[PDB]
Amino acid sequence: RFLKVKNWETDVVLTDTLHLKSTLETGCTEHICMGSIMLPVRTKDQLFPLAKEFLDQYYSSIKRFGSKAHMDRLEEVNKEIESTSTYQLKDTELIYGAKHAWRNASRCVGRIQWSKLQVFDARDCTTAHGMFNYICNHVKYATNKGNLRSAITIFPQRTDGKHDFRVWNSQLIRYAGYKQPDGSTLGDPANVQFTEICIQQGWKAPRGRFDVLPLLLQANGNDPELFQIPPELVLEVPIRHPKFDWFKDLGLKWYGLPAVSNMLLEIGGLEFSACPFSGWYMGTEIGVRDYCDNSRYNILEEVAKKMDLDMRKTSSLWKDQALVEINIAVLYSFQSDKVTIVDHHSATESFIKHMENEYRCRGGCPADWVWIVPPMSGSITPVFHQEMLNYRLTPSFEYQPDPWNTHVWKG
Amino acid sequence: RFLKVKNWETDVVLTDTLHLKSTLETGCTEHICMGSIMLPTKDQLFPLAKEFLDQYYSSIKRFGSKAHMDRLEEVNKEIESTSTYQLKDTELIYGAKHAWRNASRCVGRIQWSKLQVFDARDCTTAHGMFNYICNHVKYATNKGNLRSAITIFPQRTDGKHDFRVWNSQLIRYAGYKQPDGSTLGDPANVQFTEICIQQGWKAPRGRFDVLPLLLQANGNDPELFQIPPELVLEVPIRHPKFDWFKDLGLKWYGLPAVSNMLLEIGGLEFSACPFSGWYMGTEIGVRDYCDNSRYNILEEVAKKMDLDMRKTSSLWKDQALVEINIAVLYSFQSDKVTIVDHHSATESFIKHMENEYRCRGGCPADWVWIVPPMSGSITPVFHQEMLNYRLTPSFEYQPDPWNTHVW
Ligand code: HEM
Ligand code: HEM
Ligand SMILES: C[C@H](O)[C@H](O)[C@H]1CNc2nc(N)[nH]c(=O)c2N1
Ligand SMILES: C[C@H](O)[C@H](O)[C@H]1CNc2nc(N)[nH]c(=O)c2N1
Ligand SMILES: CSCC(=N)NCCC[C@H](N)C(=O)O
Ligand SMILES: CSCC(=N)NCCC[C@H](N)C(=O)O
Ligand SMILES: [Zn+2]
B208 in contact with chain A, both atoms CB, cutoff 8 A = no
Q: How far apart, in whole angstroms, are the C-alpha atoms of residue B135 and residue A87?
A: 75
**Ligand nearest to the backbone CA of A102:** 1
Q: How far apart, in whole angstroms, are the C-alpha atoms of residue A129 and residue A119?
A: 20
Chain A neighbors of B31, CB-CB under 8 A: 19, 22-23, 25-26, 391
CA A259 – ligand 1 centroid, Å: 9
Nearest to A385 by CA among B77, B293, B261, B251: B293
Q: Name the residue type at position A68.
A: K
B283 in contact with chain A, both atoms CB, cutoff 8 A = no
Are A314 and B344 a contacting pair, CB within 8 Å? yes
Are A134 and A153 a contacting pair, CB within 8 Å? yes
CA B214 – ligand 2 centroid, Å: 22
3-class state of residue A142 by DSSP? helix
All domains of chain B in start order, with CATH: 16-121+148-158+262-276+346-370 (3.90.340.10), 122-147+162-233+397-401 (3.90.440.10), 234-256+279-344 (3.90.1230.10)
CA A34 – ligand 7 centroid, Å: 5
Are B290 and A380 a contacting pair, CB within 8 Å? yes
Are B312 and A346 a contacting pair, CB within 8 Å? yes
Q: Is B185 in the pocket of ligand 6 (CB under 6 A)?
A: no
Q: Which atom of ligand 3 is least distant from the CA of A285? A: 12
Q: How far apart, in whole angstroms, are the C-alpha atoms of residue A15 and residue A361?
A: 11
Which member of B313, B326, B374 has the closest CB to residue A378? B374
Q: How far apart, in whole angstroms, are the C-alpha atoms of residue B231 and residue B243?
A: 29
A298 in contact with chain B, both atoms CB, cutoff 8 A = no
Are B108 and B256 a contacting pair, CB within 8 Å? no
Distances (CA, A) of B292 to A90, A115, B269: 49, 32, 35
Q: Is A258 in the pocket of ligand 5 (CB under 6 A)?
A: yes
A365 in contact with chain B, both atoms CB, cutoff 8 A = no
Q: How far apart, in whole angstroms, are the C-alpha atoms of residue A155 and residue A217?
A: 12
How distant is the alpha carbon of residue A411 from its chain centre?
A: 31
Is residue A33 part of the annotated active site? The answer reads: no
Give the HSE-up count for residue B10: Cα atoms under 13 Å, Cβ half-sphere.
17
Pairing of strands A396-398, A264-267: antiparallel
What was the structure determination method? X-ray
Nearest to B378 by CA among B346, B354, B339: B346
Q: Do B329 and A315 touch (CB under 8 A)?
A: yes
Under 8 Å CB-to-CB from A67, ≥6 apart: which residues?
A59
Q: How far apart, in whole angstroms, are the C-alpha atoms of residue A362 and residue A116?
A: 18
Nearest to B281 by CA among A313, A311, A327, A291: A313
Q: How far apart, in whole angstroms, are the C-alpha atoms of residue A347 and residue A341?
A: 10
Q: Do B36 and A32 touch (CB under 8 A)?
A: no
Q: How far apart, in whole angstroms, are the C-alpha atoms of residue B200 and residue B1?
A: 56
**Number of neighbours of residue A394 by Cβ within 10 angstroms:** 21
Chain A neighbors of B298, CB-CB under 8 A: 380
Burial (0-12, 13-18, 19+ Cβ within 10 Å), B66 = exposed
Chain A neighbors of B28, CB-CB under 8 A: 26, 28-30, 32-33, 35
State which of B105, B141, B294 you would mutate to test the pocket of ligand 2, scoring each by most atoms of that ligand within 8 A of its C-beta: B105
Pairing of strands B116-119, B149-152: parallel
A193 assigned to a ligand binding site: no
Using N-to-C axis directions, what is the helix angle for A44-61 and A91-103, rounded to 10°? 90
**Ligand nearest to the backbone CA of A38:** 3
Distances (CA, A) of A66 to A54, A57, A71, A92, A227: 14, 11, 6, 18, 48
Is residue A111 part of the annotated active site? The answer reads: yes
Q: How far apart, in whole angstroms, are the C-alpha atoms of residue B374 and residue A302?
A: 21
Q: How far apart, in whole angstroms, are the C-alpha atoms of residue B46 and residue B50?
A: 6
Nearest CA-CA distance, residue B181 and chain A, Å: 16
Give the HSE-up count for residue B389: Cα atoms under 13 Å, Cβ half-sphere.
21
3-class state of residue B193 by DSSP? helix
- The strands making up A259-260's β-sheet, listed across from edge to edge, are A118-121, A151-154, A277-278, A259-260
Q: Is B289 in the pocket of ligand 6 (CB under 6 A)?
A: no
Is residue A325 part of the annotated active site? The answer reads: no
